[PDB]
Every structure is written in structure tokens, then in C-alpha cells.
Design a protein around this ligand. Sequence first.
Ligand code: A1CGG
Ligand code: A1CGG
Lengths: 522, 520
Amino acid sequence: EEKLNEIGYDDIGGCRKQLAQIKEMVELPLRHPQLFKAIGVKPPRGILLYGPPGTGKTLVARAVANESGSFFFLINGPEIMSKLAGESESNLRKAFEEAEKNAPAIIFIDELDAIAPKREKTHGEVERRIVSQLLTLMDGLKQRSHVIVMAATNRPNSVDPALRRFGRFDREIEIGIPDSIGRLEILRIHTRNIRLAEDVELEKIANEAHGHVGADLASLCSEAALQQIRNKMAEVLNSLAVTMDDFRWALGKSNPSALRETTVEVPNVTWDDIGGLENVKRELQELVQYPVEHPDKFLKFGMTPSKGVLFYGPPGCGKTLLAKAIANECQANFISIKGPELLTANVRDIFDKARQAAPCVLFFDELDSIAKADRVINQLLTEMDGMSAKKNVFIIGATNRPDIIDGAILRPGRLDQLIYIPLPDEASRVNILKANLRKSPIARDVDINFLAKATQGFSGADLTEICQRACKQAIRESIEAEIRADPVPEITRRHFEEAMRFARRSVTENDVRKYEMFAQTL
Amino acid sequence: EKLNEIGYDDIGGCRKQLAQIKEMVELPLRHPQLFKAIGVKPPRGILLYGPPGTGKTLVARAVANESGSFFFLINGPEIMSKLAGESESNLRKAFEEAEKNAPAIIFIDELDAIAPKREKTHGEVERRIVSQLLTLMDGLKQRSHVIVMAATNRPNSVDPALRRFGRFDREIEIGIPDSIGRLEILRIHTRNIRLAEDVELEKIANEAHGHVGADLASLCSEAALQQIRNKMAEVLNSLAVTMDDFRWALGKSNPSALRETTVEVPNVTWDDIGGLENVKRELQELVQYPVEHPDKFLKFGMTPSKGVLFYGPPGCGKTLLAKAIANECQANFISIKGPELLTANVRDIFDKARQAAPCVLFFDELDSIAKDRVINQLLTEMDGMSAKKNVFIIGATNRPDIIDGAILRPGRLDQLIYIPLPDEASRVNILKANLRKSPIARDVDINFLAKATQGFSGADLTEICQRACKQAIRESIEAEIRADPVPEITRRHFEEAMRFARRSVTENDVRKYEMFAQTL
Ligand SMILES: */C(=C/C(=O)Nc1ccc2oc(-c3ncccc3C)nc2c1)c1ccncc1
Ligand SMILES: */C(=C/C(=O)Nc1ccc2oc(-c3ncccc3C)nc2c1)c1ccncc1
């Protein structure tokens, strides 16, 4: 009782932008109705929160209610649907009547898809009755009454379309997987009572906890604390403090439930990691950054920003790292979609998730798998064709066979600019080598400049693999020396020499000429 | 009190339809004697359909309040949320009270809930309520003055028995508003909001594409909220929404009617594209004369040919020409594309055209459909198209060879028009129209560019012009970061743009089209 009435914004983690949105949408209207009524802002009536399970979207409504001083009423879908025919209707009606009786109030309908699934899923007559009663109650909320209905679901498609119309649920907020900062916030919240040793660095755990949601991180802390019992099992109880090794063990064996869900975050890849050419850097900056950062010039000179690119070139890491870097430059969200993912209605969903994030780079890797000289490609054409050119969403394609791409996806207004990504030059190769080996020690004798001079035409994967091989050899001698017995603390020159013998190339001039002729034809 | 005060002025975006409903539902219910004497039978069922968010839910109440009739409201969800017998009791009571208080209007909001397609309604009570509605509808005597109005998203969702003669014969589509309708909606929604002196709602109306009235209300709310943001008793009094707030709201609005087809008179004129005088005269003959001079057509007893297949090099002039000819005649323009059809929608499109007596139905990328289900479905619908109705079909294909010889028969599209590369005058017009919105330097001579640019397609010219502005923006930022050093697009920008300009149609393609023309 007391605990639930004392959770606020600090006790919810992983959603800080959405939390600010909801604060502005709800708390301010319910604290100063006079101002909004005077200026003429209509407070929202229905807010549908959706996202993967375990994201903490079940606490947002209660946090807002507690921090705004508004009466909070909770409706559980399973609880309503577990009652008899008339009792469920009575409970819904009583919920809304009580909310109106004491206002301002917030009504939270957990698992809305249980009460109001798609009409096809519903088979009986009582279920349609409860859906219709919910619609009637929603439409019965006067603009004066200060009742805001908040609903939680996994996918809004699972809810009956009649509920998502205007006046019932017109605002939808997605509370998705948290980023590194969100994961760190969640870990701090969950470790508020667990005693931790002096060697815990929650930042590393947050950075390495990919595909984790709030619920998963709670399990990770529980598992890490459990092992501290195993190793150590009054004085024993007092000497218990979770250690970094326990956290690493827990993270290694944890199966996150959100590995397959697309991520939307600003990538941590900069220009220096990849290097790149000045021409391509300037071109990408012109195409993307200026519309986002300098719209005044654009409107002044009255041009519509062209918002489509088709990266084409050799097949390595070149095109995707460039897209992530340009996204990082503008602090814009990055959405990466591969051909296999699309091949396996989802096109509209991905475009909607792009439109939700205003500055966004939508990457379509392996575009050839879809656009080739049938249902999916038409969907991509129509969805992108009906994309307003005044919205800061940039669609960046990528294909290693630019001659198999149909002309429909290159028709101006869809993707009107083609950029070539050549084999990295000497400076680019130096940058790639340094970036790959940053997280490993290198003997002072090893000179990356000479290696870059020797490596001509090696693709990005090659340099990564050359580094992996030279390292893989280092582990072998480390074990071999250990078995014989830090005899080998650094990756000396000999390791790179013997790792630079059976590495020849991955794409020779034989296929470079293909792209270099395609360039001349364009 | 507030509901009873709603009138015609309080609904926006449906001026034509509201005039139609006026002539259908007010003049009769106000002067029954005249209509009875002449022999006009007032309608008994009117089904208003369209996208959500429109004022189609308020048309019935406006008509009731302005005609003095008694208004009764039936909600689909409310009726269907009751028990087995209470739903029928409510419907019967509604109709009985309407008959008692005649003249009256019965509005059934969300008819699809009460009477969805019979494939649905797996239960037995739902069929009972649908049959009760049908029985009540058939029970309205012609002498009684009860008019039943209904609202739905798509009439296909309603039971086909409800849409017969005598139940719901008339069907009015209240759809996405045009620029004037959007301006009316904005004026209605901003009657209480305080507006600054620097706000001109015409621009907002023009730029708010795919916006229904609800979206415009949301836009106004967001603009006011951003004013509150930027500014947070004197503070209360010093709040006035500003043009910047409206532009922000437009920028970050997500309208719900982007994917819905538009039916409006395009704002494209001949001067924006030029075109050959031959093509202009031919299009005039085919389209304008039947619409503007039908007496002569009847006099000479010649049935006008309805159909053209524009063929030529890819670009924009096959679509802009259709828009221009539609604009000349103030006729509606419907633009369909191959991607849309590939994904019976054809009958729906043809009905949305037949609804508008004068129209120009444009089928772009026709090669995709023609050379199996769709093409035959497209052929049959046109073959069943009366030649005396002012619906013109204007196809457009960039590869006139792959098109089957079936679409090109003399009841179907029976005329071929060639749209060549724009001549010098056409290029001058295209260049001038493209940069009408961009401040140009007085030194630039578009005539010289037109002389130099030979064979460049419409897209090419637009791209050449876009590059010239891209150079201008870069120089503006470069000067700004170094520091209006670059107020206008100078000649040098155009020179740089031309330096790497490339023709988009090879002379081989021009020769191929010339050979095809010689074939005809
Ligand atoms: C780097 C590469 C990537 O994501 N994909 C990729 C695609 C194709 C490919 O072929 C090779 C190859 N290299 C050498 C010899 C033979 C072959 C087939 N490597 C690749 C790699 C990357 C991008 C983003 N993040 C991490 C890595
Ligand atoms: C103009 C054109 C349009 O709507 N579509 C279109 C079709 C084909 C096409 O090819 C190019 C092109 N141009 C230069 C080089 C390469 C290519 C493939 N551009 C287009 C454009 C238009 C009509 C109506 N409203 C606005 C624009």
C-alpha cells in the first residue's frame, strides 16, 4: 500500500524521453488546467503505451498519478475477463464511475489486448459486449472531466481498431528496449539494496547487456547475487558483497528476451574508426546534416531536401559503418534492417517506427534481396513514395550488386543519389587497423604504417581477419608457453608476419572493375 | 445547449456535400407540400461514409437543428453493449419516438457495429438486431417524415441488405478536405484560441496535406502547447500562438490520411509546363469540348471517345499534362499508380470517378498492370462505362511496346498521344516554373540555359535546378561558419551544376519512340 503510493519518476528506468513526453502530456494539464484552457490546448483522453514485456511501462501510469496527485485506478485485463458475464461489465463501469467521482484521475488498463482483442480473435458474444462497453465508456468522457485513460499492450495491432480512433486512443507511446544509459539506470534502481563490492563498475555491465530489458536486468542481479552465495557457501552473512566476477558470470549465462527486437539508438561509431574519403564525407554531410541543422537556408533558397541514397560498392563493412557514422555525427537514431529480416505489413511498421523518431537514418542492408529485376518491393515503393520530403527521415540503401537493382527504387523521389564506396586507401587502412586493434595490446615495435603500406586493396573484413589471425596466434603461444611452464604479453611483429602470409585478398581487381565500370556508366 | 446550437457554419471541409444534403433533407422537410404536389419522393435512407475524423458525425445534427426537425441519436457500440433484448428495445424506442415527433432525423453512428457483413456476426443475437433494423427501416411509411442517416467508414462493411432500395439508397462520401476545406476547419477550431498578428492560416491550410479536421485540431493544440513551452497574470494575457508554432506543429504532425486517394482540381496550369500546341489542342478537343459544349455533340450525333494512352520518354509531363487539362476544365483529378493497383479496388476507383460527373482518371505506369486478374477486371469495367458520362481515362506508359492490344480498342483507350522531349520554349517554361520559389540572381539568363540544355527531360531540369540550390546552400553555410554573403543563386552556381549535368534519355530511346510513332 505505502510502497505503491511512493514510486515516482526516479523508480522507473529505461524510458527518459517517453517519461518526459508523458509528464508534459499529463502532469502539466492536471496541475494547471487554467492555463491550458485559456490558451486552448485540449488534454489527451487516451494514451496507449506499447512495447516489449518487462520494460516498466506498467509503472509509468502509477508514477504519473503519484507525482501529479491524481487518483489512480487499475484495471487488469485478466481480472476483468476472469469474472462472470455481468460482473466484468459492472467492474468496468464502476472503475470509470469512481474515476469520475474523484478527479483528476488516471485509469490504467493493463493488458488491453485481453479485454479488447481484434474482432477476429473474439468468438463469443460476451467479449464483444465488453469491447463495446469499453468503447461507450471511453466516448462518454466529457472534455471537462479530468480523467485520462492509459492502456498498456505489446503491439497496438493486437487491439481492436475501433479503440485507436480519434477520441478514444489517439496518442501512442512506444517504450522499447533501453540503451546503455537506460540499462545503467535500471541497474542502479535494482541494486539499491544489494550490497556491492568496491570493484563493481555497473557502466561496463550496462554496456555489455545487449538485448536486455528491465525484467532481464533484475534476473541478472539475482543470478549474480546467487553465485556469491555459492562461492561463499553471521560473519558469513555480513561478509557477502556481490563482486564484478559474479556479474560477468551472470551476464555470460543470461538469455535476454529482447535479442531479436530492432534497436533504435544513436550509434557509438565515429568517423575516426572508419576513416573514409573526403568526398563521401562531404556528400553525406550535405545530404543529411544540413537539413537537420540548417533548415533556415533550405527554406530560404526554397529547395526540397532529397532524402534517399543507394550506397554501392565492394561487399565488406564499408557502407554500414559509414551510415552509422553519419547517424552519429547528427546525433540521430539509426535503424538497421537486413534483407533476411524483411524476407522472413512489416514494411509499414518499420517506416512508422522511423517516422516516430524524427531525425533518423533508415538503413536497408542487402537491398538486392528485395529489389531485383514482389509483394515486399511494391510495399517499399509505396511506403517511401508516400513519404513527405519535409520530414528528417533519411533512407540509406546498400547493395553489393548495383547492376541487379531495379530502376523503380532509383526513380527520383525514391532514391535519387548514388554513392560509391571504394577500397580503403592507405590512410583509411591505417584507421581501420588502429580501430580493430584498439582493445588489444600491440608491441611498440609493430608499426601500423608499414602494414598499411604492404596491404593494398584489402577490404574491411580482411583487415579485421588479419588482426584476428595475428591475435589468435598470440593466444596459442600464451597457452603453449603456459603448458611448458607472461612470456607473451604483447602481440609482437612476428605474429602479424605469420598472420600476413596466407591472407591474400577477398575482392581483387577482377570485381573492382565491375564497380569501376558501373561508375563510368553513371 | 451547445449541441442544439450546431449549424452549417460549425462544420467544415464538406461544403459541396452539405449543400447536397441540404437539398435532400431540408427543403423537403420544410416545404413538403410542393414536393408532394410535383411528385418528388424524399429519401428515407442516407449513408454518409468516409475516413475517420471528418465532420460526418455532425452533419446530421446540423441538418436537424437548421431544419427544425427532431434529432435522435443511436450509437452502435451503445446498442451492442446492452443485453440480448435491450438492444432491440432501444432501436424500437428510437424509431417509435422519431415517428411520434415527426419530422425527425435518426442518426445511427457506426452502423458497421450494428450491421456488419453477414460473414461476421457468428452469434444469433447479432443477426436478430440486423433483421430488426431492416424491419424497422422497411416500416417507414412514405407519408411519415422520418429520415434515417447513418455513418460508416467503408460501405462495404455494412450488410449488403441494408444498402438496397428503400433501406439506405442514397450514399454521400464525405472525404478528405481540400485547401479551402482545411482553411475552414482551421478557422472553426481557432475561434477561441488567441492568434498573433503574424499568423496566416492560408499557408497552414495549403501545407497540411492528408489532414482531416481532427488532425487540424491536434495541430492547433500542439502549436498552443509549444507557445506555452517557449513562454514558460501578465504571462497568461501575453500568450498568442505564433506562425513558428504552427510550422513546428506541421513539421512534427503525423496525419492519419496520407495514404488515402485525393480528389481535387489540381493547381497546375499550362504555363508551368508549356507543351506542344498540337497536344494542347488535341487534349482540349477530347476533354473540354464534351464538358463545355455538349449541345453540338448531341446535334452531330457523335459519341465522344473517352480514353487516351499517353506514351513517351519517362519524366513528369505525362502526369502534369493530365493535371493541366483537368485544371482547365475545373474537373476532378484522380491519380492511380501501378504500385497501388498491384498491391475489387478497381471498381472502387471507377465508382469514385463515376461519382464526380466531370473527372480525369489518370492511370500511371499502366505497363505494370497490362502485359492477369487486374487487367481483365480493368478491361471489363471500362467496357461497361457509358460513353455519355464525363469520365475521362488518361493512361500513361513509358514503354508503349509492352502494352497489350486489348486496352487499345475503340471502346477502350482509342487514342495515342506522343509527349516528346520539351522544345526550347518548353524548357524555358520548366526552368522558370521550377525556380519560382527560389530567389534568382538578375544576371542568370534562363534563355541561354534553355539554348544549351538540349534533350534534358523534365526530371533532368529539376535535378539541374536542385543542384544549383545545393551549391548555394553549401556556400551559405561555408561563409557563415567562416564569418548574407550569398543572398541569391549566382551564375557560377548554375555553371557548376551544368558542369556534370547528364542527359537521362539516350538518343537511342528517342529513335525508338520515333520508330514506334512511325508504326502508328
Ligand atoms: C563488416 C562486414 C559485414 O557486416 N558484412 C560482410 C558481408 C560480406 C562479407 O564478405 C566477407 C569476406 N571477407 C573476406 C573473405 C571472404 C568474404 C566472404 N566479409 C563480409 C562481411 C561489419 C559491419 C558492421 N559491423 C561489424 C562488421
Ligand atoms: C516527375 C516525374 C515523376 O513523377 N516520375 C519519374 C519517373 C521516371 C523518372 O526517371 C527519372 C530520372 N531522371 C534522371 C536520371 C535518371 C532517372 C531515372 N526521374 C523520373 C521521375 C513529376 C511528376 C509529377 N510531380 C512531380 C514530379
